[PDB]
Design an enzyme around this catalytic site. Sequence first.
Site, PDB file in Angstrom:
ATOM      1  N   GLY A 232     -12.986 -19.211  22.473  1.00  0.00           N
ATOM      2  CA  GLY A 232     -13.228 -17.817  22.156  1.00  0.00           C
ATOM      3  C   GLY A 232     -14.031 -17.024  23.173  1.00  0.00           C
ATOM      4  O   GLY A 232     -13.938 -17.229  24.386  1.00  0.00           O
ATOM      5  N   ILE A 233     -14.834 -16.103  22.662  1.00  0.00           N
ATOM      6  CA  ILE A 233     -15.651 -15.264  23.514  1.00  0.00           C
ATOM      7  C   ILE A 233     -17.096 -15.744  23.467  1.00  0.00           C
ATOM      8  O   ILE A 233     -17.566 -16.236  22.441  1.00  0.00           O
ATOM      9  CB  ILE A 233     -15.600 -13.785  23.063  1.00  0.00           C
ATOM     10  CG1 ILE A 233     -14.143 -13.344  22.824  1.00  0.00           C
ATOM     11  CG2 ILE A 233     -16.251 -12.911  24.127  1.00  0.00           C
ATOM     12  CD1 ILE A 233     -13.531 -13.807  21.491  1.00  0.00           C
ATOM     13  N   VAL A 234     -17.799 -15.611  24.579  1.00  0.00           N
ATOM     14  CA  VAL A 234     -19.182 -16.038  24.619  1.00  0.00           C
ATOM     15  C   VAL A 234     -20.074 -14.855  25.021  1.00  0.00           C
ATOM     16  O   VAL A 234     -19.729 -14.092  25.925  1.00  0.00           O
ATOM     17  CB  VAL A 234     -19.369 -17.201  25.622  1.00  0.00           C
ATOM     18  CG1 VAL A 234     -20.804 -17.706  25.573  1.00  0.00           C
ATOM     19  CG2 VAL A 234     -18.411 -18.336  25.290  1.00  0.00           C
TER      20      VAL A 234
ATOM     21  N   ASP B 153     -12.530 -34.893  30.964  1.00  0.00           N
ATOM     22  CA  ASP B 153     -12.080 -33.571  31.303  1.00  0.00           C
ATOM     23  C   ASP B 153     -13.144 -32.692  31.948  1.00  0.00           C
ATOM     24  O   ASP B 153     -13.160 -31.471  31.766  1.00  0.00           O
ATOM     25  CB  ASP B 153     -11.509 -32.891  30.071  1.00  0.00           C
ATOM     26  CG  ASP B 153     -10.816 -31.589  30.410  1.00  0.00           C
ATOM     27  OD1 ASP B 153      -9.967 -31.600  31.339  1.00  0.00           O
ATOM     28  OD2 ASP B 153     -11.134 -30.565  29.757  1.00  0.00           O
TER      29      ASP B 153
ATOM     30  N   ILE C 207     -20.690 -12.828  28.455  1.00  0.00           N
ATOM     31  CA  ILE C 207     -20.987 -13.563  29.681  1.00  0.00           C
ATOM     32  C   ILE C 207     -19.788 -14.352  30.170  1.00  0.00           C
ATOM     33  O   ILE C 207     -19.719 -14.713  31.346  1.00  0.00           O
ATOM     34  CB  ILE C 207     -22.148 -14.558  29.489  1.00  0.00           C
ATOM     35  CG1 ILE C 207     -21.937 -15.367  28.219  1.00  0.00           C
ATOM     36  CG2 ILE C 207     -23.476 -13.831  29.420  1.00  0.00           C
ATOM     37  CD1 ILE C 207     -23.139 -16.211  27.880  1.00  0.00           C
ATOM     38  N   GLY C 208     -18.844 -14.618  29.269  1.00  0.00           N
ATOM     39  CA  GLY C 208     -17.660 -15.374  29.642  1.00  0.00           C
ATOM     40  C   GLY C 208     -16.595 -15.479  28.564  1.00  0.00           C
ATOM     41  O   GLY C 208     -16.795 -15.063  27.415  1.00  0.00           O
TER      42      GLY C 208
ATOM     43  N   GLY D  86     -13.244 -18.231  27.216  1.00  0.00           N
ATOM     44  CA  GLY D  86     -12.673 -19.555  27.340  1.00  0.00           C
ATOM     45  C   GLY D  86     -11.499 -19.753  26.406  1.00  0.00           C
ATOM     46  O   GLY D  86     -10.828 -18.787  26.021  1.00  0.00           O
TER      47      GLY D  86
ATOM     48  N   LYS E 100     -21.531 -18.387  21.048  1.00  0.00           N
ATOM     49  CA  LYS E 100     -20.102 -18.625  21.143  1.00  0.00           C
ATOM     50  C   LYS E 100     -19.502 -18.485  19.730  1.00  0.00           C
ATOM     51  O   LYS E 100     -19.984 -19.098  18.767  1.00  0.00           O
ATOM     52  CB  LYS E 100     -19.892 -20.033  21.703  1.00  0.00           C
ATOM     53  CG  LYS E 100     -18.455 -20.497  21.813  1.00  0.00           C
ATOM     54  CD  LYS E 100     -18.416 -21.962  22.261  1.00  0.00           C
ATOM     55  CE  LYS E 100     -16.989 -22.449  22.420  1.00  0.00           C
ATOM     56  NZ  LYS E 100     -16.891 -23.902  22.738  1.00  0.00           N
TER      57      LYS E 100
HETATM   58  C1  LIG Z   1     -20.579 -13.899  35.673  1.00  0.00           C
HETATM   59  C2  LIG Z   1     -20.241 -15.260  36.249  1.00  0.00           C
HETATM   60  N1  LIG Z   1     -21.222 -16.258  35.839  1.00  0.00           N
HETATM   61  C3  LIG Z   1     -20.810 -17.392  35.170  1.00  0.00           C
HETATM   62  O1  LIG Z   1     -20.146 -18.269  35.726  1.00  0.00           O
HETATM   63  N2  LIG Z   1     -21.196 -17.468  33.799  1.00  0.00           N
HETATM   64  C4  LIG Z   1     -20.766 -18.662  33.031  1.00  0.00           C
HETATM   65  C5  LIG Z   1     -21.941 -19.339  32.318  1.00  0.00           C
HETATM   66  C6  LIG Z   1     -22.667 -18.310  31.414  1.00  0.00           C
HETATM   67  N3  LIG Z   1     -23.800 -18.971  30.715  1.00  0.00           N
HETATM   68  C7  LIG Z   1     -23.678 -19.799  29.597  1.00  0.00           C
HETATM   69  N4  LIG Z   1     -24.787 -20.290  28.973  1.00  0.00           N
HETATM   70  C8  LIG Z   1     -24.603 -21.098  27.869  1.00  0.00           C
HETATM   71  C9  LIG Z   1     -23.363 -21.464  27.340  1.00  0.00           C
HETATM   72 CL1  LIG Z   1     -23.335 -22.487  25.951  1.00  0.00          CL
HETATM   73  C10 LIG Z   1     -22.246 -20.908  28.060  1.00  0.00           C
HETATM   74  C11 LIG Z   1     -20.815 -21.124  27.758  1.00  0.00           C
HETATM   75  C12 LIG Z   1     -20.317 -22.038  26.838  1.00  0.00           C
HETATM   76  N5  LIG Z   1     -18.961 -21.979  26.821  1.00  0.00           N
HETATM   77  C13 LIG Z   1     -18.528 -21.040  27.715  1.00  0.00           C
HETATM   78  C14 LIG Z   1     -17.207 -20.640  28.045  1.00  0.00           C
HETATM   79  C15 LIG Z   1     -17.052 -19.632  29.024  1.00  0.00           C
HETATM   80  C16 LIG Z   1     -18.174 -19.045  29.654  1.00  0.00           C
HETATM   81  C17 LIG Z   1     -19.492 -19.451  29.320  1.00  0.00           C
HETATM   82  C18 LIG Z   1     -19.679 -20.476  28.330  1.00  0.00           C
HETATM   83  N6  LIG Z   1     -22.418 -20.091  29.173  1.00  0.00           N
HETATM   84  C19 LIG Z   1     -23.173 -17.128  32.289  1.00  0.00           C
HETATM   85  C20 LIG Z   1     -21.999 -16.458  33.018  1.00  0.00           C
END
Ligand SMILES: CCNC(=O)N1CCC(Nc2ncc(Cl)c(-c3c[nH]c4ccccc34)n2)CC1
Length: 332
Positions: A32-34, A145, A26-27, A29, A49
Site C-alpha cells: 500500500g501507501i506509506v 527476497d 514517503i513511499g 509499495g 503503512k
Molecule cells: C524520497 C526517497 N527516499 C526513500 O527512499 N524513502 C524510502 C524509505 C522511507 N522511510 C521509511 N521508514 C520506515 C518504514 Cl517502515 C518505511 C517503509 C516500509 N515499507 C515501505 C514501502 C515503500 C517505501 C517506504 C517503506 N520507510 C523514506 C523515503
Amino acid sequence: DNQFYSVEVGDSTFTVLKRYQNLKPIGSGAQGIVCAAYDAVLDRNVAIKKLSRPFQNQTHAKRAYRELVLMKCVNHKNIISLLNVFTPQKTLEEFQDVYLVMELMDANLCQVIQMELDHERMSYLLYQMLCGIKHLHSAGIIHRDLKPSNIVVKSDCTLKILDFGLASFMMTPYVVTRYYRAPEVILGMGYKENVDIWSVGCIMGEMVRHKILFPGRDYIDQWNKVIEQLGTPCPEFMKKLQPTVRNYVENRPKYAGLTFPKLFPDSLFPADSEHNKLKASQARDLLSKMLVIDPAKRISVDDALQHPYINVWYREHTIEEWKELIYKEVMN
Ligand SMILES: CCNC(=O)N1CCC(Nc2ncc(Cl)c(-c3c[nH]c4ccccc34)n2)CC1
C-alpha cells in the site's frame, strides 16, 4: 470524541489515531501507501503503512498475517521494529484496513546505491545486513527476497530490513523485481541459509557498479545475464537440477565468463590511499565469494561475517477466515 481522524493522501484516505499528526507520503509499495508522521505521545517521528483490505486475497492476506505476526515476535536492531498497530474500524464485520506504525527511517538502499560510499560505510551497511539476516536465520526465517527497496537506512548509517521475505496470481498493476533472486530460487532447485548471501552480493555489486548486476524482463533474460558475466556453472551444479530444467540450462550457450577484477575493476573502488587500496582487494574478494552460482561453493553468512572486510565491526483460508485471523492478531 472519536480517537481517529481522516486525512487525504493522494488517492486514498488515512484514518489514523489522533496521536499521529502531519501525515506525509514517503513511499509506495505492493502492500500500500506509506506515510511519515509525528507521534505526539512518544514525541518522535514514525512511519505509518496502511493495509487496504489485506484479506481481499490469499496473496495479500498471507503476507499481512505473516508480517503482522513476525513483526511482533522477532526483535533485532537490524530489523524494522513495530511501534503500534491499529484499525479505525470497531468490529470484525466493519473491519477493513490495518495500519502499521514503525520507527521512521530516512531512506532505502536504492538511494544509497546512486552514490559513492567510502569503505568504512559500505562495509558497515553490509555488516548490518549480515547481522539481520543472521538473526532471521537463527529464527528459522530465510528471507530469499532481500532487495534495495526492502532495506532502509538512517543518516547515521544505521540499517534495518523491512520485511520477512517469501513463505500467487494478482490483478495488480505493478510487478515485482527479481534481479536479486538467487540461482537456486530462479531454477527452483531447493535452497538453504546461504541463499540470501546471493542477494547481498547482488546489492554490494550494485553499490560498486552503481547499476543492477542482473537485469532482465523475465527469468530467461536474468539467467543469461548471470552466466554472461560469471559463466556457466560447474557439472556438480547441473546434476542437482530437475531434467525439465537441467535441459534448458545445459542446452544454453556456455561461457566461462570474465573474472572478478574485470567485472569490478579498480576504477570502481577508491585506490588513492594505501588503506583504500587494501580495502578494495578485500571488498572484491568478498564479492567473489558471494556472487557464486553454486550454493555448495557460495560463502555462508557466518563466514562472510568473519571476512576481514566485514569483521572490523564484529495454510489456505477463505477471504472470510483470513479477515478473522488478521483481525484477531490486530486486536492483540
Ligand atoms: C524520497 C526517497 N527516499 C526513500 O527512499 N524513502 C524510502 C524509505 C522511507 N522511510 C521509511 N521508514 C520506515 C518504514 Cl517502515 C518505511 C517503509 C516500509 N515499507 C515501505 C514501502 C515503500 C517505501 C517506504 C517503506 N520507510 C523514506 C523515503
